[PDB]
Amino acid sequence: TSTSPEQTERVFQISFFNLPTVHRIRDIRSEKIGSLLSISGTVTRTSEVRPELYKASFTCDMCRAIVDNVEQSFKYTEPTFCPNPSCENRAFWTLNVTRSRFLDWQKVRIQENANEIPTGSMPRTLDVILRGDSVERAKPGDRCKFTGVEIVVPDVTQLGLPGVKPSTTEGLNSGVTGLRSLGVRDLTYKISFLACHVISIGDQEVFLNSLS
Amino acid sequence: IDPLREELTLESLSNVKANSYSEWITQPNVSRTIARELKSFLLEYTDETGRSVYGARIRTLGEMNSESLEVNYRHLAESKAILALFLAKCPEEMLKIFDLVAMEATELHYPDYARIHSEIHVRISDFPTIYSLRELRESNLSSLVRVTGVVTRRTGVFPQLKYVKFNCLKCGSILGPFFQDSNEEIRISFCTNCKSKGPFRVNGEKTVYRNYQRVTLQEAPGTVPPGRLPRHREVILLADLVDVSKPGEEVEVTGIYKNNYDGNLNAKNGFPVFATIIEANSIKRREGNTANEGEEGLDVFSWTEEEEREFRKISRDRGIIDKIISSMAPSIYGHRDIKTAVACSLFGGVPKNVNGKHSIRGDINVLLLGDPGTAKSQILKYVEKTAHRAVFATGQGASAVGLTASVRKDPITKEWTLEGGALVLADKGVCLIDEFDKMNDQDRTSIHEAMEQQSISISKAGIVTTLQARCSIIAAANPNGGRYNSTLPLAQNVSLTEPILSRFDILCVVRDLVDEEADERLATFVVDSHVRSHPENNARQRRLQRQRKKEEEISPIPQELLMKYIHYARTKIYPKLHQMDMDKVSRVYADLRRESISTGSFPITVRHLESILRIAESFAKMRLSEFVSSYDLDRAIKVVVDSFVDAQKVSVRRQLRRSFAIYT
Amino acid sequence: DDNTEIIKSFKNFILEFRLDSQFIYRDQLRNNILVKNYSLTVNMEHLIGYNEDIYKKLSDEPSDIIPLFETAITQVAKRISILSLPTFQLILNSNANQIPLRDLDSEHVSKIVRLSGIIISTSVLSSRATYLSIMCRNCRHTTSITINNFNSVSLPRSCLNCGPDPYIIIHESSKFIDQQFLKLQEIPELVPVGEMPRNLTMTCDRYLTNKVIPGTRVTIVGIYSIYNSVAIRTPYIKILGIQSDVETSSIWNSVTMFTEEEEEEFLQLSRNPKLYEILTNSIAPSIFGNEDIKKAIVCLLMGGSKKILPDGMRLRGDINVLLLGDPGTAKSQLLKFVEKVSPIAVYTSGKGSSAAGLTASVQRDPMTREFYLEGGAMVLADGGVVCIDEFDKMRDEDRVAIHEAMEQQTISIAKAGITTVLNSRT
Amino acid sequence: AHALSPRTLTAQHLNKLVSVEGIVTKTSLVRPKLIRSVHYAAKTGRFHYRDYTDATTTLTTRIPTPAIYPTEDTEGNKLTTEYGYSTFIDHQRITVQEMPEMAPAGQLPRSIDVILDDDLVDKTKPGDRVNVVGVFKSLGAGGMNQSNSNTLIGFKTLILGN
Amino acid sequence: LFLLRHSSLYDSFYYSNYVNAKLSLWNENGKKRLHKMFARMGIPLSTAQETWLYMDHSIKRELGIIFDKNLDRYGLQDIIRDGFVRTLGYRGSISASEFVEALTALLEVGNSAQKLTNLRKRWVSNFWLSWDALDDRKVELLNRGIQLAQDLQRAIFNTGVAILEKKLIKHLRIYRLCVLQDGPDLDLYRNPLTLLRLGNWLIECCAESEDKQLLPMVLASIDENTDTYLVAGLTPRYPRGLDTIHTKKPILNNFSMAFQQITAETDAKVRIDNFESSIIEIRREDLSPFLEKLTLSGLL
DNA sequence: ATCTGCTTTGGGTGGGTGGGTGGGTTGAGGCAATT
DNA sequence: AGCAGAT
Ligand SMILES: Nc1ncnc2c1ncn2[C@@H]1O[C@H](COP(=O)(O)OP(=O)(O)OP(=O)(O)O)[C@@H](O)[C@H]1O
Numbered sequence A: 001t002s003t004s005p006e007q008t009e010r011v012f013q014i015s016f017f018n019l020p021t022v023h024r025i026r027d028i029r030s031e032k033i034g035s036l037l038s039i040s041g042t043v044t045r046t047s048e049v050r051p052e053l054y055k056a057s058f059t060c061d062m063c064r065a066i067v068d069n070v071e072q073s074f075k076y077t078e079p080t081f082c083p084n085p086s087c088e089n090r091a092f093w094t095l096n097v098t099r100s101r102f103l104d105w106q107k108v109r110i111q112e113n114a115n116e117i118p119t120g121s122m123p124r125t126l127d128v129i130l131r132g133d134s135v136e137r138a139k140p141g142d143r144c145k146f147t148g149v150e151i152v153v154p155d156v157t158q159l160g161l162p163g164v165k166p167s168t169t170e171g172l173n174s175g176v177t178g179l180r181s182l183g184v185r186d187l188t189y190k191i192s193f194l195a196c197h198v199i200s201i202g203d204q205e206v207f208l209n210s211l212s
Numbered sequence B: 001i002d003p004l005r006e007e008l009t010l011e012s013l014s015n016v017k018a019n020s021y022s023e024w025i026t027q028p029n030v031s032r033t034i035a036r037e038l039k040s041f042l043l044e045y046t047d048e049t050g051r052s053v054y055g056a057r058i059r060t061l062g063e064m065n066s067e068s069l070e071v072n073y074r075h076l077a078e079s080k081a082i083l084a085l086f087l088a089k090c091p092e093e094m095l096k097i098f099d100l101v102a103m104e105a106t107e108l109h110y111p112d113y114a115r116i117h118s119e120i121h122v123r124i125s126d127f128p129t130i131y132s133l134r135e136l137r138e139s140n141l142s143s144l145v146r147v148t149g150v151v152t153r154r155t156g157v158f159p160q161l162k163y164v165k166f167n168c169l170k171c172g173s174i175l176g177p178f179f180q181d182s183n184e185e186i187r188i189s190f191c192t193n194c195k196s197k198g199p200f201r202v203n204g205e206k207t208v209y210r211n212y213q214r215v216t217l218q219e220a221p222g223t224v225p226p227g228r229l230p231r232h233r234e235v236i237l238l239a240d241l242v243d244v245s246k247p248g249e250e251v252e253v254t255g256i257y258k259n260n261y262d263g264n265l266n267a268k269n270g271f272p273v274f275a276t277i278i279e280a281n282s283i284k285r286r287e288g289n290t291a292n293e294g295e296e297g298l299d300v301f302s303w304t305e306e307e308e309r310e311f312r313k314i315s316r317d318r319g320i321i322d323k324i325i326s327s328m329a330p331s332i333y334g335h336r337d338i339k340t341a342v343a344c345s346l347f348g349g350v351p352k353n354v355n356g357k358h359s360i361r362g363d364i365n366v367l368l369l370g371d372p373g374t375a376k377s378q379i380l381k382y383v384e385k386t387a388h389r390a391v392f393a394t395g396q397g398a399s400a401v402g403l404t405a406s407v408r409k410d411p412i413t414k415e416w417t418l419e420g421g422a423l424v425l426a427d428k429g430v431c432l433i434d435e436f437d438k439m440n441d442q443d444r445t446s447i448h449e450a451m452e453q454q455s456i457s458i459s460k461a462g463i464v465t466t467l468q469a470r471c472s473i474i475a476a477a478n479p480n481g482g483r484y485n486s487t488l489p490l491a492q493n494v495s496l497t498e499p500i501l502s503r504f505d506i507l508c509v510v511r512d513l514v515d516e517e518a519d520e521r522l523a524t525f526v527v528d529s530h531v532r533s534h535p536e537n538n539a540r541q542r543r544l545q546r547q548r549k550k551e552e553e554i555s556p557i558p559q560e561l562l563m564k565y566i567h568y569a570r571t572k573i574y575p576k577l578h579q580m581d582m583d584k585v586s587r588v589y590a591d592l593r594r595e596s597i598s599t600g601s602f603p604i605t606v607r608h609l610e611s612i613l614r615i616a617e618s619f620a621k622m623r624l625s626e627f628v629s630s631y632d633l634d635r636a637i638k639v640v641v642d643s644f645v646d647a648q649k650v651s652v653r654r655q656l657r658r659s660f661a662i663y664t
Numbered sequence C: 001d002d003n004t005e006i007i008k009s010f011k012n013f014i015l016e017f018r019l020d021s022q023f024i025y026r027d028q029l030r031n032n033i034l035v036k037n038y039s040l041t042v043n044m045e046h047l048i049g050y051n052e053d054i055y056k057k058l059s060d061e062p063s064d065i066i067p068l069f070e071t072a073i074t075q076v077a078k079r080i081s082i083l084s085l086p087t088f089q090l091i092l093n094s095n096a097n098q099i100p101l102r103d104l105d106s107e108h109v110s111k112i113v114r115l116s117g118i119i120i121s122t123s124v125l126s127s128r129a130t131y132l133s134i135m136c137r138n139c140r141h142t143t144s145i146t147i148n149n150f151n152s153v154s155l156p157r158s159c160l161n162c163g164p165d166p167y168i169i170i171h172e173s174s175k176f177i178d179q180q181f182l183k184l185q186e187i188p189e190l191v192p193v194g195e196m197p198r199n200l201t202m203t204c205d206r207y208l209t210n211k212v213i214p215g216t217r218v219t220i221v222g223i224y225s226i227y228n229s230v231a232i233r234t235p236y237i238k239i240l241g242i243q244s245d246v247e248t249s250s251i252w253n254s255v256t257m258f259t260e261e262e263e264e265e266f267l268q269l270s271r272n273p274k275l276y277e278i279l280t281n282s283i284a285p286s287i288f289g290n291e292d293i294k295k296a297i298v299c300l301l302m303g304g305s306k307k308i309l310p311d312g313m314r315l316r317g318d319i320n321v322l323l324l325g326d327p328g329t330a331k332s333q334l335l336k337f338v339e340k341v342s343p344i345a346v347y348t349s350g351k352g353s354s355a356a357g358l359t360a361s362v363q364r365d366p367m368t369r370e371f372y373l374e375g376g377a378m379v380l381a382d383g384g385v386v387c388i389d390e391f392d393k394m395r396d397e398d399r400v401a402i403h404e405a406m407e408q409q410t411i412s413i414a415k416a417g418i419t420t421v422l423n424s425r426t
Numbered sequence D: 001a002h003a004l005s006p007r008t009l010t011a012q013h014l015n016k017l018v019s020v021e022g023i024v025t026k027t028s029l030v031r032p033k034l035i036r037s038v039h040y041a042a043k044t045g046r047f048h049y050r051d052y053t054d055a056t057t058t059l060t061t062r063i064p065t066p067a068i069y070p071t072e073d074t075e076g077n078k079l080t081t082e083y084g085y086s087t088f089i090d091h092q093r094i095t096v097q098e099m100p101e102m103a104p105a106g107q108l109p110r111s112i113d114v115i116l117d118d119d120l121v122d123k124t125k126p127g128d129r130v131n132v133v134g135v136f137k138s139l140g141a142g143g144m145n146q147s148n149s150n151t152l153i154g155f156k157t158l159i160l161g162n
Numbered sequence E: 001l002f003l004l005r006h007s008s009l010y011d012s013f014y015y016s017n018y019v020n021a022k023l024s025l026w027n028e029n030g031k032k033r034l035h036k037m038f039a040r041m042g043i044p045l046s047t048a049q050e051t052w053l054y055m056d057h058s059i060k061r062e063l064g065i066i067f068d069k070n071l072d073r074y075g076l077q078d079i080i081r082d083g084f085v086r087t088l089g090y091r092g093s094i095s096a097s098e099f100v101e102a103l104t105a106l107l108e109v110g111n112s113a114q115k116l117t118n119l120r121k122r123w124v125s126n127f128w129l130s131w132d133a134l135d136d137r138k139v140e141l142l143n144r145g146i147q148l149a150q151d152l153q154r155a156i157f158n159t160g161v162a163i164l165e166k167k168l169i170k171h172l173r174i175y176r177l178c179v180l181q182d183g184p185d186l187d188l189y190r191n192p193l194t195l196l197r198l199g200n201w202l203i204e205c206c207a208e209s210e211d212k213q214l215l216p217m218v219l220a221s222i223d224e225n226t227d228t229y230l231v232a233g234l235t236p237r238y239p240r241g242l243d244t245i246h247t248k249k250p251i252l253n254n255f256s257m258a259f260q261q262i263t264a265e266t267d268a269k270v271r272i273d274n275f276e277s278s279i280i281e282i283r284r285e286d287l288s289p290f291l292e293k294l295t296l297s298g299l300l
Numbered sequence F: 001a002t003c004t005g006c007t008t009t010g011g012g013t014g015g016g017t018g019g020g021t022g023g024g025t026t027g028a029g030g031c032a033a034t035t
Numbered sequence G: 001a002g003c004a005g006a007t
């Protein structure tokens, strides 16, 4: 019919399952950060699917140069040095949503199963992040088994966002400081999850074709 | 020859020589070719009849001083497939080109139309693919989508700046105007001349404004999975689209799915997630039309200039007043009185304000008081399908403030406000109440004022206002004990009281009696209907033809044509009583009163004297006649007198029928 | 440059406009300055007749030329009253077609419009500045500013080193005027299908303040403008004239708004030997019979007379009427007529009402977090008549909440600190 | 003609001596207000002082004085504040409401804000009928500063009681 | 156009005899055609409906150019004409045609044998209102006359619509007939002037046009207070603004002779005292014999 | 190393196109469900 | 006033 011009590069995802062991929510510690493991919990809330910036592409405001494949950290990121030798722009850019690649993104909140709660104890909770085709695979009230990587998410408000003014434990949750971006503020952290797989524990012609 | 003025061909347009579709469309020569092809499509397209569709659509557009040309997606897809593909994938630039070409086509017919409206907005009607608010993903970004939902929150109409002009704080130079994107603000960081990092002041000698409004779309309860929470999105309605949709209404929004940067969203989520909105391009009212989904256009109750040159042949014929009654719920076997009452209520009377001091209701209310399996709820559902604006309510599923209006505290402004209920949604429409006799007494007494004065008065939480509820009520009820007792009077067979009963223009009592011949006909008709409706019993043209053949068997007038006809009659025709036999009406009214003096009989008041005239006006309206005729008054008198006689007891029914035979 | 010529043109209209042998505007100005009413009401049909060019300017750019017609009026007033005075207000009258409240949109921004509506709320008067005296923080340099209330002004940003914003206002040497805010709702009949009535914010200046009360139909001539409170602006109307069918000023104060010629007509009508019959027949001409109820309605509209005894006891002077009867009797129609004939009236349904809806309700301001009082049906109808339809559907408590206001004609409140005894003579 | 009520007070009466009658509906708490501070320079052995003024403590406009206590002498000596010799005065704000029985037809009563300083601080309680004499004033910038973008808000006003 | 300078540009076209004749505004197609014309001319509907004084001045100035190209297409070209306009300093300018219309409206609705005498006395009274309106010191009377003229034209339009929708006009071989018996505003037509106004309206619309043969028309109206008819013969008129040899010749009114002959021959009880001999009064029960004899006379 | 410039507390002298999982929390009034 | 940035 026609020659499609928009054939970008697939964004593959690797999903692992069938790990030897499955961890409870209460057994998540900080020694396993950045490692691959599975956890089990009953979903309680699910966010809405939003587009997440993955490979931003900007253009220089003055010489109209282009920057492609700008890996994005937990906060909005822009280039610091134009590739044009004659250019002097360092902190002036405009995003280009046509060339930018976005990924789906959903936030799922889970809590430990009832039978695993010590008697008369409030439940523990966690926030799981799904991406790509693993979105909307968990409905509230289900007992799922996520498999991903335990990560730590910084408080992006302190790190410095465009157009955002920065800002249980009785003041003892003091973060780390001294970073260049953090002038006089501190950076506090949270434990999160990045699932790559989800399992939920709990017309004649068309029908015939399905059967063996 | 200037290279910028050269053009390609259609096949040369199908093969793309850019890295993205937007860049392909934006090129000069490609844009010229696309504009030429769109103009050719507008000028040359012909439907089956062979007459131009969009020439007539432009003529009517100019007639009404409107600035919106409705274009069918299917027509464009058939005439030009590549252009439809481009519009689907890159809607912004394609819509810009199509607006320019549409203005050029409109100026063809009205040379100086630029003096009425500067621009014409093209509206897409039937996008083949429909999404939900749960099914929207990143792949749909910057592409045309069609979604449904319920307008749960609306804002006032604000004049937005079409062009913003900036001036340097230091240099003082004034930058040229720049197009404003409703999705997000426009800012200038690097000045072309001053080259100053400092902000530039926002100022302008003269600007043109456009209307702006925002609505919060929410998933309709019908589509959301049972028990789950509903998703929602935000839609931006620019000029000519503001106030088309109202709170509490279903809608079908066609627009562009767009995303922009939001700092707060990134701060709360912790990831660089953008905010998404829909830029509305058209709206279709889906409320109360669940049974009309098989229909083209953004309005299914609107007419061309050729469909109302024939609603006026159908109506000069001599028996339209009775082919219309036949076409009311043809899938119901009998019940001629019920169908006549329903038709009268659908067409309705003419409201009149005498000297600006006296207000007289102009709508007809009907009550069906029958036995269990007598096709009442089906009639109510049909009336819901056919009426322009209808709302369905059931006995205990409705509240006193659910009908009429309620008072809430706005979550945003934290100030008391007023919401419209069923009767407000049924303004200039029909409110169908089923299980009328099982309602709560408190809820039932709420509609008294609305059923006669056509207004709702609220004095609550510092609000003192009166609304408009110009709605007719068709209610179905079940007699005491579940089965009508013909030996007792009507008053004893229902729990309603005189004030509520007197507000119903027509009372239709239905009885289920075992007559072998009557049972024979009804069963034959029902079984034939079940055979007819069986699912198994060009492709679109063939489907339409078979549907038409199936429909013709039981309805003399097509249902869609009938809907358009009823809407046209209710909009454009206001019959007036000039020549009438006063003595006849006076003498029938006096007879009705004297015969109704009996205890337990159906109440008779001046309301029914006025109901006779209302029904006569409705019958005159059915013929698209500007003056009420003697035959119409005779028919209305017959309707009222019969409806009165049928409600009598068995013992006196024969005497009453003999006494009233003069008028029937 | 052009401003002086425009001012000269509007000054020649006030000094040269004669329709016969009387200078209408020169004489109107002198008569107004003599009673201390510094304003001039000009009819726009007269300006279109003197020079159509002057009307073209006043209609093309209203917020720029109106300020230059005020100074012309002031100069002429000085010439006429002072033998060698604040800036005079200009009130406009027009007969142009009225735009429906909901038809006002981006096409009418910064233009003179005429519209009608119902006033639902009025604000406490504020004070706007008209002549500021300023001084510098550092070098103590004195200056003055002059402001007209027509927006498209702030203190100078740089002195005349002195940091940014160096000027502080000297209040004991400045002059201010009056400003009021009004909410305008569209007429119930104008509202489109299935739509709630829509509001619009309005502001008036000086001699156009305290001219209306909530619940009265008015006609407004003004400028449809916008003020910034992203790229959207909240519209509002800058009033240039108010016309009403209710003499609110007479009703609040003494007897006023009756011309001697108008007063003579009323005495002549009173002298009619059979005025009772005429008034009885004039109520509900379209309702047959029910003569006794119509006489009762005449008596209710007329009212009795109230007495304040020396010891302090007050005797009610109003008449309350109940209509109990069968359906179809035309009680609701009589109530809807009485609501339309009485100078002040409110039509309410007993079912769609509440104890707080009647009387007064306590409300919290979302900003100041402070409770205040808002009047209900019986306060909004004070000095008039309340038509409570469907009186039998009203709940027992909401009906009990009416006894004191019906007999003693007062609404005692004791809620959220607020403790008062309002007045409801209905 | 200066005998008025909270309803009849208009912009025409600003900067004038008026007498207002009504009901006291509110009464803030009494808080001392700094006027003069006296310090002692130990090395120099001499006392210094500073004078503070506000918009509500005087009738003639002056430059505002932040309440920061001086810490260093002109020559750099350390200064220790002497609170026992400083001067603070009491300050209270009340609201006076129009008499309900004197209000117009169908209008709720209005109110005005009043300031009482020094010996007039606790002479009234809510629910009392009073006649207040003072000077009608205006305060602040009233939206003339660029921070407030409204452009449709007036100046604050109130009475300094005598 | 009907009172162009004292009403909207829309109302002047809507309530004009010539425009209604050439567009058939009494039915919906006519309104659609008029709206199409306004849209083509480049005048917004809101602008057209605005009153004359406050109308946008660009369109008011261009009206001569806009009308001249656009009108010929719709067949309304003869609207263009030259007339007399009189202005008194600083007052609105009024044309001769509108002045005459105001005077006539003041004459018509300005305000057994006993009732007839009372009606004639009332008309004699209206004469003096119309006479006063001729003095420049009396301008309120002229404005009052313009308002009444607009009201009367609206009423005539409604009555003509009712007559044409019902097809009350009987097309006999000698003449056309139209008798009103139950109209809504039948008290208006007791005055010969208002009856002639309605007659002219009918004569122009669907009688002047349609390419039908010229036939005189008879118009009658009833009044229950006196149970009698006010018959009024009307001369036919050639298509307006069509200069021709046959159009040059004038057409006479023969109804006086036939009416007198029939009255003398039959025991008619007709009153022929009106100055216009074509207008008489008949009793309720004599109209049928009178019209039968009229048809059989053949002298019409 | 010096000069230039923004923003608090928390509060309506920033707001409701930032919201209430960013805190400012009693009081009144309307509505459904419970009676 | 403390801290964040440009010359
Ligand atoms: N003279 C009249 N007498 C009675 N009803 C009349 C009269 N003229 C008109 N009506 C009709 O009365 C109807 C209005 O109802 P009405 O006010 O009589 O009810 P109500 O008796 O007060 O109320 P409800 O029936 O609820 O007790 C309108 O339809 C109006 O047409």
Ligand SMILES: Nc1ncnc2c1ncn2[C@@H]1O[C@H](COP(=O)(O)OP(=O)(O)O)[C@@H](O)[C@H]1O
Pocket: B331, B332, B333, B334, B335, B371, B372, B373, B374, B375, B376, B377, B378, B522, B526
């Ligand atoms: N006269 C009739 N013609 C056709 N179908 C009928 C008729 N009477 C009853 N039915 C059947 O009854 C069913 C609807 O019953 P319904 O009207 O809902 O009962 P109710 O009157 O209690 O609401 C339909 O399936 C319809 O086919």
Ligand SMILES: [Mg+2]
Pocket: B376, B377, B434, B435, B476
């Ligand atoms: Mg049912």
Ligand SMILES: [Mg+2]
Pocket: C331, C332, C389
């Ligand atoms: Mg009633």
Ligand SMILES: [Zn+2]
Pocket: A060, A061, A062, A063, A064, A065, A082, A083, A084, A087, A088, A089
């Ligand atoms: Zn660069």
Ligand SMILES: [Zn+2]
Pocket: B168, B171, B172, B173, B191, B192, B193, B194, B195, B196
């Ligand atoms: Zn610059």
Ligand SMILES: [Zn+2]
Pocket: C136, C137, C138, C139, C140, C141, C159, C160, C162, C166
């Ligand atoms: Zn200075």
